[PDB]
Assembly symmetry: C2
Homo-oligomer: 315 residues x 2
């Protein structure tokens, strides 16, 4: 199968590229390298089944060229930084809504049969039902990022129905592991490398969120994709997260422990009731019953995934 | 209170303007007259409480000008309802996502405290539960128009939470009445005026939809708005439709009757199972229990609304 991975030079994208290349897919990566790096995929350069295109998906000609002769698109290009929402909403809109719109216009009449989209738990906002099922509603995102992800899902559904392709929408929890350059673990490790004596923690440390290691995440994406390929649904919605959750404070403790440091935790007290920033969801735990029906399950719980990520990042 | 009505020269917007002006609001209209008309609101020019701005919401400067010194925005500007099947994805994206995005960016730098948005039943797609409640999910719109409306809702919710204003999202069923130049009744009347002997009906005539007369619709918008003003919800979702529904064939019969005509009905059979066009939902009936708890209820059922609309249009 011929596949396009947008954002394939990024964190999740490069691990996905690795898996697809190792299973004999013909893989084209489209990435503007605004956050990704060729280093994440450099072992594949020159491989006859691999092609890399450096291009900004704001440019419709580049997107139309990248979808040509492709059977499936894994659309992982985005700016995933929730924190920047109250300073740079334009960036989040452009890199989540606008470029997905461009992709969808390119996909129309292109012979692409499948579109896999990495959405986010943030589409649920402060979800009132926990663990949160895929049919939870009203969907009320509280960040510009979660709103942009939800808007992208909507456009995908409408285009899939109108121009006859199939869409797999995967709402990810927090994904951590090697090659990650955003999120709380990354922030904590680099802060403690700069100053081992103190740790600036945004918010009050009580935010509880489900974490998945990249290995379980890629396994789950492939399991869902293969199940989807064999199914009949035009648009399919799946949560992908862990069975449990962990607090920001516990993450700081694990990071400190693995670095053999004992810093003073400096909690900023946050906003809107201890959130780290405007739009930061306080409680997140996705139901994964639907994903588990495919046979997938995480091998590591949230605490193990955090500890493994820290160890990997310090080596 | 000072309010801005985008699309205020259109069908619903001009009736809303009438009501707000009669209740002593200071009203500003923003409309590019792409589908609306000066005739719908010209009677208010010269009133010291009324201002008209002819401007395209693709223009960020005019939107920024229009939100100045405004307390509430009623955002009714959108793609026209006339033949939505034949409208291109680019037009739908620009007139639903793009101009809403421009509005939200203007609002974050203003004194706007409330944003009311007329969304559409089409965000529900082919809902499996009928009457369809506000918490129906997964939302899987089947047209680019329904997807674009859902994208606008998402952006509104995220901006509301991030930039501290309150949003009232009202999902409208089919709205009919005087000044409407869209939809099946208007098309049927003009077709029978051109040729009284035959009526070409798109689709199979069995599409069943909830119709609300404009008078009930404005009553409901105001009831929900006043209730929302007295509440604390940051973002609130309401359906606004009728208790019942009616088929295209029945509407054609009513139109013929009120015109004293007896034409031959020629059903084209449509597409995708008798739909009038690609992406036309076959069955639509919104649950209005939530709205009815505010004390609102439709005075006219779908049949009465159709009959009154026909009489008004023939005047
Ligand atoms: N990492 C997480 O915890 C997480 C959680 C939920 C969802 N997601 C989603 O998963 C996907 C991957 O995220 P990630 O964490 O690997 O982020 P990342 O930033 O590492 O990867 C995203 C890639 O997109 C590329 N990109 C950005 N804008 C682009 C543009 N205009 N044109 C082309 N390429 C562009 C970047 O260069 C980057 O390589 C995204 O859709 C993200 O929203 C991630
Ligand atoms: N009429 C219905 O049955 C129905 C059903 C569901 C939702 N709605 C929604 O209700 C709202 C009003 O619909 P309506 O039936 O009154 O439609 P309408 O076309 O009569 O009113 C929309 C108005 O917006 C204006 N407009 C469009 N694009 C603009 C732009 N870029 N800048 C400025 N003005 C612009 C048009 O000139 C028009 O006056 C819309 O949001 C529509 O999607 C209507």
């Amino acid at each position: 199968m011929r596949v396009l991975v947008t954002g394939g030079a990024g964190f999740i994208g490069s691990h996905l590229v690795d898996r697809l290349m190792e299973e004999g897919y013909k893989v084209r990566v489209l990435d503007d390298l605004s956050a990704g790096s060729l280093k994440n995929i450099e072992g594949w350069l020159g491989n006859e089944n691999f092609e890399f295109i450096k291009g900004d998906m704001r440019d419709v000609e580049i997107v139309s060229k990248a979808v040509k002769d492709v059977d499936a698109v894994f659309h992982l290009a985005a700016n995933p930084e929730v924190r920047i929402g109250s300073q740079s909403p334009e960036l989040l809109y452009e890199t989540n809504v606008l470029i997905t719109y461009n992709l969808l216009n390119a996909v129309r009449n292109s012979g692409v049969k499948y579109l896999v989209f990495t959405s986010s738990s943030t589409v649920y906002g402060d979800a009132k039902v926990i663990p949160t099922p895929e049919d939870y509603a009203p969907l009320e995102p509280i960040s510009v990022y979660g709103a942009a992800k939800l808007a992208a899902e909507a456009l995908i559904s409408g285009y899939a129905h109108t121009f006859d392709f199939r869409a797999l929408i995967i709402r990810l929890a927090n994904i951590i592991g090697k090659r990650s350059n955003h999120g709380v673990i990354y922030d904590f490790i680099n802060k403690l490398k700069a100053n081992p004596n103190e740790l600036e923690i945004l918010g009050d440390g009580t935010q509880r969120k489900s974490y998945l290691h990249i290995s379980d995440t890629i396994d789950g994406i492939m399991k869902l994709f293969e199940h989807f390929l064999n199914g009949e649904e035009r648009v399919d919605f799946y949560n992908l997260g862990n069975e449990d959750w962990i607090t920001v404070k516990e993450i700081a403790e694990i990071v400190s422990e693995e670095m053999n440091l004992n810093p003073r935790f400096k909690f900023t007290g946050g906003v809107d009731g201890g959130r780290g920033w405007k739009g930061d969801v306080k409680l997140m735990l996705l139901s994964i019953e639907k994903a588990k029906r495919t046979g997938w399950k995480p091998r590591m719980n949230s605490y193990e995934a955090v500890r493994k990520t820290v160890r990997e990042m310090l080596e």
